[PDB]
């Protein structure tokens, strides 16, 4: 606020405790989980459970490509598992619970989202 303490805010709204998906460098396919391990500046680092930390990245604040817990059931995708784990064994909530983390909010991929329908053509349900 103008009025006040002088000092505005760079961070996006990221922190530290918060998981996420990402993807790879090595595939723009491959979706991996990932852990906030540093905030800073308009980007935030990206640690992968299980390898070191020196393999960190930062990404972009507003990505695309980064997405909050149970995202890629959401949309209908096979999300993959850290190092040593399985897609059938790894069970987010699970890990959720041990380490009584609290999947990133919603509000942090506020960016990217799907416009209302023209009000015209309404297609059925399948399931």
Not at 20 to 47: F, M, N, W
Not at 49 to 70: E, K, M, R, T
Not at 72 to 97: A, D, I, R, V
Request: net charge negative.
């Amino acid at each position: 606020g103008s009025s006040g303490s002088s000092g505005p805010y760079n961070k996006n709204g990221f922190k530290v405790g918060m998981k996420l998906e990402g993807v790879d460098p090595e595939h723009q396919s491959v979706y991996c989980v990932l852990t906030v391990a540093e905030v800073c500046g308009y980007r935030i680092k990206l640690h992968f459970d299980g390898y070191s930390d020196c393999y960190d990245f930062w990404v972009n604040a507003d990505a695309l490509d980064i997405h909050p817990v149970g995202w890629c059931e959401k949309t209908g995708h096979k999300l993959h598992p850290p190092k040593g784990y399985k897609e059938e064994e790894f069970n987010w909530q699970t890990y959720l619970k041990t380490c009584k983390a609290q999947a990133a909010p919603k509000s942090l991929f506020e960016n990217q989202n799907i416009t209302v329908i023209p009000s015209g053509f309404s297609g059925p349900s399948s399931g």
